[PDB]
Scaffold this active site. Structure first.
Site, PDB file in Angstrom:
ATOM      1  N   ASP A 153      57.502  -7.604  37.406  1.00 65.47           N
ATOM      2  CA  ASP A 153      57.906  -8.176  36.228  1.00 65.47           C
ATOM      3  C   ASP A 153      58.433  -7.836  35.270  1.00 65.47           C
ATOM      4  OD1 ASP A 153      58.358 -10.644  34.883  1.00 65.47           O
ATOM      5  OD2 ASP A 153      56.515 -10.790  33.943  1.00 65.47           O
ATOM      6  N   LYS A 155      60.538  -6.598  32.269  1.00 64.40           N
ATOM      7  CA  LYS A 155      61.468  -7.304  31.683  1.00 64.40           C
ATOM      8  C   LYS A 155      61.061  -6.599  29.576  1.00 64.40           C
ATOM      9  CE  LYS A 155      58.705 -11.207  31.555  1.00 64.40           C
ATOM     10  NZ  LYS A 155      58.345 -12.934  31.677  1.00 64.40           N
ATOM     11  N   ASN A 158      57.047  -7.148  28.321  1.00 62.40           N
ATOM     12  CA  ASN A 158      56.572  -6.195  28.878  1.00 62.40           C
ATOM     13  C   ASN A 158      55.865  -5.094  28.602  1.00 62.40           C
ATOM     14  OD1 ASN A 158      55.674  -9.610  30.057  1.00 62.40           O
ATOM     15  ND2 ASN A 158      56.793  -8.664  31.758  1.00 62.40           N
ATOM     16  N   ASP A 171      51.108  -6.183  31.713  1.00 63.19           N
ATOM     17  CA  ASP A 171      50.875  -7.985  32.243  1.00 63.19           C
ATOM     18  C   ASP A 171      51.625  -7.456  33.772  1.00 63.19           C
ATOM     19  OD1 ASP A 171      52.519 -11.148  31.244  1.00 63.19           O
ATOM     20  OD2 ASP A 171      51.238 -10.894  33.494  1.00 63.19           O
ATOM     21  N   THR A 188      60.876 -12.956  36.309  1.00 63.42           N
ATOM     22  CA  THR A 188      61.688 -13.822  35.903  1.00 63.42           C
ATOM     23  C   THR A 188      63.404 -14.143  35.977  1.00 63.42           C
ATOM     24  OG1 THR A 188      60.057 -13.395  34.457  1.00 63.42           O
ATOM     25  CG2 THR A 188      62.092 -14.110  33.314  1.00 63.42           C
TER      26      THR A 188
HETATM   27  C1  LIG Z   1      48.251  -4.968  24.222  1.00 63.50           C
HETATM   28  C2  LIG Z   1      48.476  -5.722  23.289  1.00 63.50           C
HETATM   29  C3  LIG Z   1      49.526  -6.804  23.384  1.00 63.50           C
HETATM   30  C4  LIG Z   1      49.792  -7.107  23.901  1.00 63.50           C
HETATM   31  N1  LIG Z   1      51.254  -8.811  24.722  1.00 63.50           N
HETATM   32  C5  LIG Z   1      50.622  -8.163  26.330  1.00 63.50           C
HETATM   33  C6  LIG Z   1      52.013  -9.240  26.808  1.00 63.50           C
HETATM   34  C7  LIG Z   1      52.178 -10.905  26.104  1.00 63.50           C
HETATM   35  C8  LIG Z   1      53.229 -11.725  26.947  1.00 63.50           C
HETATM   36  N2  LIG Z   1      54.096  -9.782  27.263  1.00 63.50           N
HETATM   37  C9  LIG Z   1      53.823  -8.917  27.026  1.00 63.50           C
HETATM   38  N3  LIG Z   1      50.103  -7.964  26.954  1.00 63.50           N
HETATM   39  C10 LIG Z   1      49.662  -6.861  25.562  1.00 63.50           C
HETATM   40  C11 LIG Z   1      48.757  -5.363  25.939  1.00 63.50           C
END
Ligand SMILES: c1ccc2[nH]c([C@H]3CCNC3)nc2c1
Ligand SMILES: c1ccc2[nH]c([C@H]3CCNC3)nc2c1
Ligand SMILES: c1ccc2[nH]c([C@H]3CCNC3)nc2c1
Ligand SMILES: c1ccc2[nH]c([C@H]3CCNC3)nc2c1
Length: 337
Positions: A153, A155, A158, A171, A188
């Site tokens: 994944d 991108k 992420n 992710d 994706t």
């Molecule tokens: C820690 C802090 C912020 C975060 N945001 C996300 C995802 C949401 C979709 N892409 C990233 N994982 C995190 C882990």
């Protein structure tokens, strides 16, 4: 070099010990105060541990939606991998647990936001900057692939930017331990390798293809294959045709033709020399691989934020309630979580 071989051997030893005996049930929801939604079958929320005052990011999944969306195996992969890996550029899982309705993964909070927002704010990253971030992904995939993991994944959304300006990959919902090939249609659209689109059995070469897409997107400002309909994106991906901006260096174009190679048996990262064909490519001639791994290189930029609980680099979402049932849902399916 033996030092690299020894590093990877010890990394696999430590991963397998946790892989074979996963941690489970290491906190509970009452231990954390809810602060804000950071991203949204699942959502990620900023939380604060009520005894220590430490901030964390908590990924919440509704079990009934996971079942309905056929993600049971994927969700189990994600948690089992995250509790077992350890690398400077991977977000650290701190706790996990489940309740009657939901699954919870509590991770380090990375306050600088997603690479995607910084990329779209500036427009594009200049090659030296794109190379700094790409070097971290090369090292991270060397580590994951040595554990027989495929990430699937990659991108900009992420990749989070930390307080020192370095990447933390988040992710792992599509990550999987694979000894030979795997077959699931996932990822994706813009980032999928041709062999995924064509329903073939595929391997870690799909991550190297995705690195080609990511480097192109960082240096150009937009990805190489795009359209309104996924089927149109897929036709471009399988065609073998890529156009490069005239400002790309010759060395960058050369690297990207070898990463974006439609025949997986000819793609860089998937040849006899493995990752070393990428690390020794002329586009990386200025990269000090050990200095990057040791976090000794001054980053392209440091994100602006006021403290460990600042959410300014993340966007605003509707604050929705979590589902709460008095009966346990999907207990058998998630026994091992
Ligand atoms: C820690 C802090 C912020 C975060 N945001 C996300 C995802 C949401 C979709 N892409 C990233 N994982 C995190 C882990
Ligand atoms: C994130 C989301 C929802 C949350 N609810 C809670 C507490 C409130 C009383 N029992 C659980 N912490 C949360 C963290
Ligand atoms: C060396 C080895 C493994 C490491 N894990 C981490 C954390 C901190 C940033 N995200 C993971 N730093 C490391 C340094
Ligand atoms: C907050 C308020 C109302 C809620 N009802 C539910 C579940 C219980 C049965 N199916 C809906 N969770 C809630 C959380």
């Amino acid at each position: 070099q033996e030092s690299v071989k020894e590093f990877l051997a010890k990394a696999k030893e430590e991963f397998l010990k946790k892989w074979e005996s996963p941690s489970q049930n290491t906190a509970q929801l009452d231990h954390f105060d809810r602060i804000k939604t950071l991203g949204t079958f699942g959502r990620v929320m900023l939380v604060k541990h009520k005894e220590t005052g430490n901030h964390y990011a908590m990924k919440i999944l509704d079990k009934q939606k996971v079942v309905k969306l056929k993600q049971i195996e994927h969700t189990l992969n994600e948690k089992r991998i995250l509790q077992a890996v350890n690398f400077p550029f991977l977000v650290k899982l701190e706790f996990s647990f489940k309740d009657n309705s939901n699954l919870y993964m509590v991770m380090e909070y990375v306050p600088g936001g997603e690479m995607f927002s910084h990329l779209r704010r500036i427009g594009r990253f200049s090659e030296p900057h794109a190379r700094f971030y790409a070097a971290q992904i090369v090292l991270t995939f060397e580590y994951l692939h040595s554990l027989d993991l495929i990430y699937r994944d990659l991108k900009p959304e992420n990749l989070l930017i930390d307080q020192q300006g370095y990447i933390q990959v988040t992710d792992f919902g599509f990550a999987k331990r694979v000894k030979g090939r795997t077959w699931t249609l996932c990822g994706t659209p813009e980032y999928l390798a041709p062999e995924i689109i064509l329903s073939k059995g595929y391997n870690k070469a799909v991550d190297w293809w995705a690195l080609g897409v990511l480097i192109y997107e960082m240096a150009a400002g937009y990805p190489p294959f795009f359209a309104d309909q996924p089927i149109q994106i897929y036709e471009k991906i399988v065609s073998g045709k890529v156009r490069f901006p005239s400002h790309f260096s010759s060395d960058l174009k050369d690297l990207l033709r070898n990463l974006l190679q439609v025949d997986l048996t000819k793609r860089f990262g998937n040849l006899k020399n493995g990752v070393n064909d990428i690390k020794n490519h002329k586009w990386f001639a200025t990269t000090d691989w050990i200095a990057i791994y040791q976090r000794k290189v001054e980053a392209p930029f440091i994100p602006k934020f006021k403290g460990p609980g600042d959410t300014s680099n993340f966007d605003d979402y509707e604050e929705e309630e979590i589902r709460v049932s008095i009966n346990e849902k999907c207990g058998k399916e998630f026994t091992e979580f």
